[PDB]
A paper describes a structure:
[name] is an essential serine/threonine phosphatase that regulates various cellular processes, including cell growth, division, and differentiation. [name] is a modular multi-subunit enzyme: One scaffold subunit (A) binds to a catalytic subunit (C) to form a core AC heterodimer, which together with one of many regulatory (B) subunits forms the active trimeric enzyme. The combinatorial assembly of these subunits generates a wide range of [name] complexes, resulting in diverse substrate specificity and subcellular localization. The precise regulation and assembly of [name] remains still a subject of active research, and conflicting findings have been reported regarding the role of carboxy-terminal [name] C-subunit methylation.
Interestingly our X-ray crystal structure overlayed well with an Alphafold2Multimer (AF2M) model of the [name] trimer. The Aα and Cα subunits formed a previously described complex. The B56ε B-subunit forms an arc-like protein consisting of 20 alpha helices. The B-subunit makes extensive contacts with the A-subunit (interface area of 1384 Å2), an interaction which is largely based on the charge complementarity of a negatively charged A-subunit and a positively charged B-subunit. Notably, the structure of the C-terminus of the B56ε-subunit includes an over 25 amino acid long alpha helix stabilized by the connection to the N-terminus of the A-subunit. The B-subunit interacts with the C-subunit with a large 1294 Å2 interface. The carboxy-terminal tail of [name] C ending with the leucine 309 is clearly visible and wedges itself at the intersection between the three subunits. Given the recent successes with the prediction of complexes with novel multi-subunit structure prediction methods, we asked whether AF2M would be able to recapitulate the experimentally observed ternary complex. Interestingly not only did our X-ray crystal structure superimpose well with an AF2M model of the [name] trimer (RMSD: 1.047 Å), but also all the key features of the interface including the >25 amino acid long B-subunit helix were predicted. Concentration-dependent assembly of functional trimers was observed. We confirmed that the proteins purified from insect cells are only partially methylated at the C-subunit carboxy-terminus (6–8% as quantified by mass spectrometry) and that this methylation was insufficient to explain the observed stoichiometric assembly. Here, we demonstrated that [name] formed spontaneously in vitro and methylation of the carboxyterminal leucine of the C-subunit was dispensable for its formation.
Numbering used by the authors:
A (entry chain A): 1 to 589
B (entry chain B): 46 to 455
C (entry chain C): 1 to 309
């Protein structure tokens, strides 16, 4: 039997409950994962009055089905009756918020934060808020560390009478005896302070934050200084010097390297969120100290922020600050012992070129760029080559050819192939800016030599570089310089270098034009169609398919069709497949 | 300040020279730089050799005025923030640990400390003012040291503090609980878990007959969830020792222990599963019959799944249970309850397992279930495929059911 | 018509696997079935014709295999010949072995995958490949499919009648290549005998047959290597199975060469990897390479506990 319209069904619920709390772990886990089709087959009435009280009282089994059920009930607002009945989901989830396993209570607090907005202020102050009080007052740490994440989702939509209750409750959660929940409180410090009124973020959030920032365990001090960014985003620049700054000054020169690393990693975030004048007064010596730190991780984190910090200084003093206080520490950092520090500094150092000025980067920055170019570590070398376009824009192209071009030509054949790849990827800019005469005399040899590199990735990069050089200089220059050597590679006794000819023809038919690709490149492919290696043969088929749309139909029918037909009758299967596919795509068979 | 030896000075200037020597030993040298201040490191090393051995025998040199100086000395030497580790995992049989390099001094300082608490003239009522809660908090923080020699010395030092000062015992245990809970449920990054478990193994060994509810909560809520972490191969023996000792003191606690080991049974780590089987053999070796029967049904369902696992290591470790005579005897007493749990599993692995060694072991286990409690075996092989039709029709019933549930939602 | 649509299916599978995205259980099952169909027609001594790139152990280091393809070239443009040890110890054994099997099925004559000591049920179960399949698939079906397919992998390979490629080393129960061709490899690797020794033996400075510290296989000296070479008409024995800090290592007076294609083995050893390119006329080239630059480190999340299944 069926219903008139009501979701209510005569479906036996026994055969449904005979799988949720029955069978092995996998079957009941799948039933809980699918606990939504059964809620639709039962109906809103029967789901609220016959399946939810079920799940409320069945404290059973391992944490996997518990996690699945929490995630499922996170989306059960409509299946129980809408915003009117969501309060029936709060009991089961509450039990899931006290579970020992972290993932279960985390999914539970996620589901609670999701359905928190589905309540009205009456339902919040009548069902959710008491649930928060119950969870944050439990005997075990799991309930408290899970309840620490319920304050921000129900604080703004409740009355002005439970505000002090919840505030002092969160304060009690901060002054907890176990560090486990103290860590979560320090984490949610900022998240709860952003939803608080200004009259409360400076009278009760600031003392709590300072207390957490001077705790016995650095493990919570690091989260305190992390939430400092969100906290200082609320107080005006007049109160900071009295409320946020005293904790920051001691956190900068703290005994533990972890909170110092957190200070250095969020240094520019603080710089922007707290103000520019005070950074001129306070944060510049702090940066000088962090870049001269005894720990190496802190030095690396500080060097990573050099560029974005220096370009975010005040506009008037910047030229004096970076030259008289920041640049000496940078000169010290290039000769560091730790390779991570040097690499992180080289990854951002060239960004200081437009801030300093052409003469300043020539006199003060170019020797350091050179030194990092001749560095022994490959990562710092790659990072310093990465940002060469910035330097080339600041200084002159002629000046770059005078100072840094020999180093680039040397790194063109570096031991590690990714440095060579960086040089190849910077080749088109250098060619376009230096001109075809200088390129043909100097840099053409490197671009043609990369085509027979041992690493295949370098050969692919050179293949693409050929097309880019054509896009820079012209298909006429391509026919004059590039095409002869590319076709000469067709006689290499190594099939790996022989397929590079086909790859070059493929990438060059897009830019050389129908005439050039018909009179110079097509004969080479059609001759290579009889190569002994099957790889070269199916690559000939693929290359013909690639270059097809560039020739006129007479050439496809007169010279390409017989070659593809003869390749379809080869002994290898892959060459036959590719020749037949080329015939089909080119619309020839 | 070049000071002479205590054997080259009279007895009147002996305590003030002893104190002055500890003041000099409060100077820390840089051992990461191998060539820096070579001669003065040798001076401090020799001076530390004078300080040790001197404090060993009853001699009255441990006056109250020396208590704060020796505490400040060892506090300046060992207390520090540990540097970051370039690794996130550790392999005992392959990966190698990073040493501290200041050991040529730290060892002597640690040796000085462990002998100062072990001194015959040591007075705890006076020393408790300086070995306070803030001191041990840093001391337990030092347990994350990557140097195993330092972890062994901190093991003995913490054991000595726990044994001498009874007023700190509650704080020590609570801090170890805090360390273990963070290690399990937050970040798994602690090198001193095995040493702390050895300390707790001695502490649990020295518990009272009226077992406090605090220690029962410690066993259920902390020791059992410690079985879940991946680095269980670094302290499985110590954790098993703590569990067995808890059951040797209170056999009634074997119910929450068993349920916990199967609530956290390894499903994606086979080596961890073999360790659980090895630990469970120890629990079953120190089990009582009245406590065995209380969990014999879900337990033997787990071993029924373990003997039926396609992993040859887990199958071997679970089938080797039938070689231990005591746990055999418990099977012989309750065969009519656990033989139907095992029967379908053994008969399936008598046909589907890939390892010929495993299919030979299950044959031997089946021969045991035939020699003992035959009627159970005969009326189970008679009701074999009859029950197999029952489970097969139950499966297709669930499948067509779920097909109809998906038909209704459409 | 079905062959073309399965070609599209295989190309889609390869494209998906090329970004460390595993296949479905049914996809893996069908791939393993047709891989069995292909490999059953291959001899224990697999006749491979040059040119080809010989690679050593990979050991589930998927991104390092991507780096290997960056070095030696992409298939099917570059012919490859792997010598076992695709799974275990690495973090992505499933993706690696699935990509290699899919490339073998799609390109039959382009690559040839051999059997290593880690393509056994026992070793995959002890070193964690079975556990990896358990995490990535939820059951032991995929592990069963792959271990059943492993029985079909050829034992050795013969490049141009001169290069003898195999995972382990020589065996005292083996004299000629016909003895290897006569074996029945369609079984789990035994604990001793010719099949077990060919996948577990190691070269050594110790002259004559010795006792292998691994437990299985033997240790052979240079005299045994040159005797086998002069008896079988081979100029070099290519092998893997052993770690090499240089990436490749000559031994027994250029009679044996070990090739290890797993850079920074187990992410700890800090070793270089290498591959051996053999041109159209057997001109050896050794390409060494470092581990691939791993991606950025995202915020570490709370991993799922091991009792979740
Ligand atoms: Mn091997
Ligand atoms: Mn290996």
């Amino acid at each position: 039997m069926a219903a008139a319209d009501g979701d209510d069904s005569l479906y036996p619920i026994a055969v449904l409950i005979d799988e949720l709390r029955n069978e092995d772990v996998q079957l009941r886990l799948n039933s809980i994962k699918k606990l939504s089709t059964i809620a639709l087959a039962l109906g809103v009435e029967r789901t609220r009055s016959e399946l939810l009280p079920f799940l409320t009282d069945t404290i059973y089994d391992e944490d996997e089905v518990l996690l699945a059920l929490a995630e499922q009930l996170g989306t059960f607002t409509t299946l129980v009756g809408g915003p009117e009945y969501v309060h029936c989901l709060l009991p089961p989830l509450e039990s899931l918020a006290t579970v020992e396993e972290t993932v279960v209570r985390d999914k539970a607090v996620e589901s609670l934060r999701a359905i928190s907005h589905e309540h009205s202020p009456s339902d919040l102050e009548a069902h959710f808020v008491p649930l928060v009080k119950r969870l944050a007052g439990g005997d075990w740490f799991t309930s408290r560390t899970s309840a620490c994440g319920l304050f921000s989702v129900c604080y703004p939509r409740v009355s002005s009478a439970v505000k002090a209750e919840l505030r002092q409750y969160f304060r009690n959660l901060c002054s907890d005896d176990t560090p486990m929940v103290r860590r979560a409180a320090a984490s949610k410090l900022g998240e709860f302070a952003k939803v608080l009124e200004l009259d409360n973020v400076k009278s009760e959030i600031i003392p709590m934050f300072s207390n957490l920032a001077s705790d016995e365990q650095d493990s919570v001090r690091l989260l305190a200084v992390e939430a400092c960014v969100n906290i200082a985003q609320l107080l005006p620049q007049e109160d900071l010097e009295a409320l946020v700054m005293p904790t920051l000054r001691q956190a900068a020169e703290d005994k533990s390297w972890r909170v110092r690393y957190m200070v250095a990693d969020k240094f520019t975030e603080l710089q922007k969120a707290v103000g520019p004048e005070i950074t001129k007064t306070d944060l510049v010596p702090a940066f000088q100290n962090l870049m001269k730190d005894c720990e190496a991780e802190v030095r690396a984190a500080a060097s990573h922020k050099v560029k974005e910090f220096c370009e975010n200084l005040s506009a008037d003093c910047r030229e004096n600050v970076i030259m008289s206080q920041i640049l000496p520490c940078i000169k010290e950092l290039v000769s560091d012992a730790n390779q991570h520090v040097k690499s992180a500094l080289a990854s951002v150092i060239m960004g200081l070129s437009p801030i300093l000025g052409k003469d300043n980067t020539i006199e003060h920055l170019l020797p350091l760029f050179l030194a990092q170019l001749k560095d022994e570590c490959p990562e710092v070398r790659l990072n310093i080559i990465s940002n060469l376009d910035c330097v080339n824009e600041v200084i002159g192209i002629r000046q770059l050819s005078q100072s840094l071009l020999p180093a680039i030509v040397e790194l063109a054949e570096d031991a590690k192939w990714r440095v060579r790849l960086a040089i190849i990827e910077y080749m088109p800019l250098l060619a376009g800016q230096l001109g075809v005469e200088f390129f043909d005399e100097k840099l053409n040899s490197l671009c043609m030599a990369w085509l027979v590199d041992h690493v295949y990735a370098i050969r692919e990069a050179a293949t693409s570089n050929l097309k880019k050089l054509v896009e820079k200089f012209g298909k006429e220059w391509a026919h004059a310089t590039i095409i002869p050597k590319v076709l000469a590679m067709s006689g290499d006794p190594n099939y790996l270098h022989r397929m590079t000819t086909l790859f070059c023809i493929n990438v060059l038919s897009e830019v050389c034009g129908q005439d050039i690709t018909t009179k110079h490149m097509l004969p080479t492919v059609l001759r290579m169609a009889g190569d002994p290696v099957a790889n070269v043969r199916f690559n000939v088929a693929k290359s013909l398919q690639k270059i097809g749309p560039i020739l006129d139909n007479s050439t496809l029918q007169s010279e390409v069709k017989p070659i593809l037909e003869k390749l379809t009758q080869d002994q290898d299967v892959d060459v036959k497949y590719f020749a037949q596919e080329a015939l089909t795509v080119l619309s020839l068979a | 300040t070049p000071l002479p030896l205590l054997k080259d000075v009279p007895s009147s200037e002996q305590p003030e020279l002893f104190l002055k020597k500890l003041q000099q030993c409060c100077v820390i040298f840089d051992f990461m730089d191998t060539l820096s201040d070579l001669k003065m490191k040798e001076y401090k090393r020799s001076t530390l050799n004078e300080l040790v051995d001197y404090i060993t025998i009853s001699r009255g040199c441990l006056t109250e005025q020396t208590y704060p100086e020796v505490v400040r000395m060892v506090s300046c030497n060992i207390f520090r923030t540990l540097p970051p580790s370039d690794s996130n995992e550790f392999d005992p049989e392959e990966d190698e640990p990073t040493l501290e390099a200041s050991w040529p001094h730290l060892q002597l300082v640690y040796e000085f400390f462990i002998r100062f608490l072990e001194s015959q003239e040591f007075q705890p009522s006076i020393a408790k003012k300086y070995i306070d809660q803030k001191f041990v908090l840093q001391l337990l923080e030092l347990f994350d040291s990557e140097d195993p020699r330092e972890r062994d010395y901190l093991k003995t030092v913490l054991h000595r503090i726990y044994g001498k000062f009874l007023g700190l015992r509650a704080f020590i245990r609570k801090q170890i609980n805090n360390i273990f809970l963070r290690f399990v449920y937050e970040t798994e990054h602690f090198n001193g878990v095995a040493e702390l478990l050895e300390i707790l193994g001695s502490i649990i060994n020295g518990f009272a007959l009226p077992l406090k509810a605090e220690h029962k909560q410690f066993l259920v809520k902390v020791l059992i969830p410690l079985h879940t972490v991946r680095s269980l191969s670094l302290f499985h023996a110590q954790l098993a020792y703590c569990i067995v000792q808890f059951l040797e003191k209170d056999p009634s606690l074997t119910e929450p222990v068993i349920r916990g080991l199967m609530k956290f049974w390894p499903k994606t780590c086979s080596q961890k599963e073999v360790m659980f089987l090895g630990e469970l053999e120890e629990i079953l070796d120190v089990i009582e019959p009245s406590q065995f029967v209380k969990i014999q049904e879900p337990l033997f369902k787990q071993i029924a799944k373990c003997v039926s696992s396609p992993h040859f290591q887990v199958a071997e470790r679970a089938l080797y249970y039938w070689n231990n005579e005591y746990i055999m005897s418990l099977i012989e007493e309750n065969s009519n309850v656990i033989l139907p749990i095992m029967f379908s599993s053994l008969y399936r692995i008598s046909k589907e397992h890939w390892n010929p060694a495993i299919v030979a072991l299950v044959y031997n286990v089946l021969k045991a279930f035939m020699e003992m409690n035959s009627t159970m075996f005969d009326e189970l092989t008679a009701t074999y495929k009859s029950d197999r039709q029952r489970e097969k029709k139950k499966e297709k019933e669930r499948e067509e059911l779920w097909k109809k549930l998906e038909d209704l939602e459409l | 018509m079905d062959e073309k649509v399965f070609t599209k299916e295989l190309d889609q599978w390869i494209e998906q696997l090329n970004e460390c995205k595993q296949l479905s259980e049914s996809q893996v099952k069908s791939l393993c079935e047709k891989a069995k169909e292909i490999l059953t027609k291959e001899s224990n001594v697999q006749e491979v014709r040059c040119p080809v790139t010989v690679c050593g152990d990979v050991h589930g280091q998927f991104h390092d295999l991507m780096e290997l393809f960056r070095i030696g070239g992409k298939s099917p443009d570059t012919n490859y010949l792997f010598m076992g040890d695709y799974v275990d110890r690495g973090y992505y054994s499933v993706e690696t072995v699935t990509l290699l099997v899919a490339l073998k099925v799609r390109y039959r004559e382009r690559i040839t995958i051999l059997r290593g000591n880690h393509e056994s049920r026992q070793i995959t179960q002890v070193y964690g490949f079975y556990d990896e399949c358990l995490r990535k698939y939820g059951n032991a079906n995929v592990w069963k499919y792959f271990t059943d397919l492993f029985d079909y992998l050829p034992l050795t390979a013969l490049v141009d009648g001169q290069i003898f490629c195999l995972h382990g080393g020589l065996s005292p129960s083996i004299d000629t290549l016909d003895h290897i061709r006569a074996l029945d490899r369609l079984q789990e690797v035994p604990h001793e005998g010719p099949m077990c020794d060919l996948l577990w033996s190691d070269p050594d400075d110790r002259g004559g047959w010795g006792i292998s510290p691994r437990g299985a296989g033997y240790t052979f000296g240079q005299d045994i290597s040159e005797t086998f070479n002069h008896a079988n008409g081979l100029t070099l024995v290519s092998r893997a199975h052993q770690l090499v800090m240089e990436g490749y290592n000559w031994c027994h007076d250029r009679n044996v060469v070990t090739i290890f294609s797993a850079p920074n083995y187990c992410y700890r050893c800090g070793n270089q990897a290498a591959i051996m390119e053999l041109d159209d006329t057997l001109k050896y080239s050794f390409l060494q390479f470092d581990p691939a630059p791993r991606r950025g480190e995202p915020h570490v999340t709370r991993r799922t506990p091991d009792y979740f299944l």
